[PDB]
Design an enzyme around this catalytic site. Structure first.
Site, PDB file in Angstrom:
ATOM      1  N   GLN A 257      29.142   1.351 -11.103  1.00 18.69           N
ATOM      2  CA  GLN A 257      29.232   1.776 -12.497  1.00 18.69           C
ATOM      3  C   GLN A 257      30.109   3.004 -12.808  1.00 18.69           C
ATOM      4  O   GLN A 257      30.576   3.154 -13.932  1.00 18.69           O
ATOM      5  CB  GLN A 257      27.815   1.901 -13.081  1.00 18.69           C
ATOM      6  CG  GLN A 257      27.732   1.844 -14.606  1.00 18.69           C
ATOM      7  CD  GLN A 257      26.323   1.616 -15.105  1.00 18.69           C
ATOM      8  OE1 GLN A 257      25.326   1.866 -14.403  1.00 18.69           O
ATOM      9  NE2 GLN A 257      26.217   1.138 -16.342  1.00 18.69           N
TER      10      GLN A 257
ATOM     11  N   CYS B 263      18.369  -1.680  -7.904  1.00 14.40           N
ATOM     12  CA  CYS B 263      18.189  -0.264  -8.192  1.00 14.40           C
ATOM     13  C   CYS B 263      17.437  -0.261  -9.533  1.00 14.40           C
ATOM     14  O   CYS B 263      16.413  -0.949  -9.619  1.00 14.40           O
ATOM     15  CB  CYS B 263      19.514   0.502  -8.212  1.00 14.40           C
ATOM     16  SG  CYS B 263      20.799  -0.218  -9.263  1.00 14.40           S
ATOM     17  N   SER B 264      17.895   0.432 -10.563  1.00  8.63           N
ATOM     18  CA  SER B 264      17.173   0.346 -11.827  1.00  8.63           C
ATOM     19  C   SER B 264      17.782  -0.794 -12.657  1.00  8.63           C
ATOM     20  O   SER B 264      17.112  -1.795 -12.892  1.00  8.63           O
ATOM     21  CB  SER B 264      17.179   1.684 -12.569  1.00  8.63           C
ATOM     22  OG  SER B 264      16.400   1.622 -13.750  1.00  8.63           O
ATOM     23  N   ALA B 265      19.067  -0.663 -13.051  1.00 14.13           N
ATOM     24  CA  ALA B 265      19.757  -1.687 -13.836  1.00 14.13           C
ATOM     25  C   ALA B 265      20.242  -2.842 -12.938  1.00 14.13           C
ATOM     26  O   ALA B 265      20.408  -3.970 -13.403  1.00 14.13           O
ATOM     27  CB  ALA B 265      20.925  -1.062 -14.600  1.00 14.13           C
ATOM     28  N   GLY B 266      20.445  -2.547 -11.667  1.00 11.47           N
ATOM     29  CA  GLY B 266      20.952  -3.516 -10.705  1.00 11.47           C
ATOM     30  C   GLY B 266      22.467  -3.612 -10.718  1.00 11.47           C
ATOM     31  O   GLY B 266      23.017  -4.677 -10.397  1.00 11.47           O
ATOM     32  N   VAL B 267      23.163  -2.484 -11.063  1.00 15.09           N
ATOM     33  CA  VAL B 267      24.632  -2.466 -11.149  1.00 15.09           C
ATOM     34  C   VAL B 267      25.342  -1.395 -10.322  1.00 15.09           C
ATOM     35  O   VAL B 267      26.173  -1.727  -9.486  1.00 15.09           O
ATOM     36  CB  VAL B 267      25.187  -2.590 -12.615  1.00 15.09           C
ATOM     37  CG1 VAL B 267      24.709  -3.877 -13.283  1.00 15.09           C
ATOM     38  CG2 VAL B 267      24.832  -1.384 -13.490  1.00 15.09           C
ATOM     39  N   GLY B 268      24.996  -0.127 -10.540  1.00 15.03           N
ATOM     40  CA  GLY B 268      25.659   1.016  -9.917  1.00 15.03           C
ATOM     41  C   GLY B 268      25.446   1.179  -8.438  1.00 15.03           C
ATOM     42  O   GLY B 268      26.369   0.972  -7.626  1.00 15.03           O
TER      43      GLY B 268
ATOM     44  N   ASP C  72      18.767  12.417  -8.703  1.00 12.60           N
ATOM     45  CA  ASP C  72      18.538  12.067 -10.108  1.00 12.60           C
ATOM     46  C   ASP C  72      19.863  11.826 -10.821  1.00 12.60           C
ATOM     47  O   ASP C  72      19.988  10.850 -11.559  1.00 12.60           O
ATOM     48  CB  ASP C  72      17.747  13.193 -10.825  1.00 12.60           C
ATOM     49  CG  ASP C  72      16.380  13.551 -10.247  1.00 12.60           C
ATOM     50  OD1 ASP C  72      15.835  12.746  -9.455  1.00 12.60           O
ATOM     51  OD2 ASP C  72      15.819  14.601 -10.647  1.00 12.60           O
TER      52      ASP C  72
END
Length: 286
Positions: free
Chosen positions: A267, A223-228, A191
């Protein structure tokens, strides 16, 4: 930039970790600054018509590298929060995108059809710590229609850290044309922060990368944002390709370059160090 010989890399990681990770902080700060004198436009992301197509308001798709959807018989039907990202010695080796929303499921699957994508890399759970990270864009069982793309789940293999879903996809307006889409879903990302051990992610990287079939479209990574986590995956995969070919590693130079292709790829400094750990495991494991 300037490549480090692979035999000198683990020594370099030691130096980067020393003095409370001063070296890693310096590198990550240089990555964060690599944008400073650059204005990268994201006009389509900011257009009022496209705003509901963005999971996060501050996570935009740069205009130059953005994946364009083929237009539908309105002006803004071309937009998806996705960008092409280079791999090692290969332009547009990836499509780094956000976790699709219910409203962008049609756009997402159309992009997979139009881009000839054969592999999906998912590095998020649908819900993490009670928070919605990604909407389920695929069927739980059997068949589900997403506009003109009819998706059929054919098989599932649930490993300890990741799940492999083999889908059969068809376009209703193609005279019934079938394509295999394999989804590599990492299920054990915590998480908060990064995984304790790099090895399970390294294995996820190796196996999802090895499934890339010639000569298909780019690998879709999200992933969620598509960055980290997306950026973390891209750097690990590309640096392994670099090691295999030239026996050199260039995390810093490559990351600074891909950061011009999608905002914030990798990120946090923690993800930056995690990249190093995965590569360390690959080098010592060899």
């Amino acid at each position: 930039m300037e490549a480090i010989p692979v035999k000198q890399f683990v020594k370099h990681i030691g130096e980067l970790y020393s003095n409370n990770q001063h070296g890693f902080s310096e590198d990550f700060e240089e990555v964060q600054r690599s944008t400073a004198d650059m204005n990268i436009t994201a006009e389509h992301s900011n257009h009022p018509e496209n705003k509901h197509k963005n999971r996060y308001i501050n996570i935009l798709a740069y205009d130059h590298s953005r994946v364009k959807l083929r237009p539908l018989p309105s002006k803004h039907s071309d937009y998806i929060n996705a960008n092409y990202v280079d791999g090692y010695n290969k332009a547009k080796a990836y499509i780094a995108t956000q976790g699709p929303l219910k409203s962008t499921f049609e756009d997402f699957w159309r992009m997979i059809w139009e881009q000839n994508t054969g592999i999906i890399v998912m590095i998020t759970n649908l819900v993490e710590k009670g928070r919605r990270k990604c909407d389920q864009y695929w069927p739980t069982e059997n068949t589900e229609e997403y506009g003109n793309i009819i998706v059929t789940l054919k098989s599932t293999k649930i490993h300890a850290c990741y799940t492999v879903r083999r889908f059969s996809i068809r376009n209703t307006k193609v005279k019934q044309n079938e394509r295999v889409v394999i989804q590599y879903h990492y299920t054990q990302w915590p998480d908060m922060g990064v995984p304790e051990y790099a090895l399970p992610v390294l294995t996820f990287v190796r196996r999802s990368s090895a499934a890339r079939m010639p000569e298909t479209g780019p690998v879709l990574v999200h992933c969620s944002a598509g960055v980290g986590r997306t950026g973390t995956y891209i750097v690990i995969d590309s640096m392994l390709q670099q090691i295999k070919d030239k026996s050199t590693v260039n995390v810093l130079g490559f990351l600074k370059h891909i950061r011009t292709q999608r905002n914030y790829l990798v990120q946090t400094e923690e993800q930056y160090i995690f990249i190093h750990d995965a590569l360390l495991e690959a080098i010592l494991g060899k």
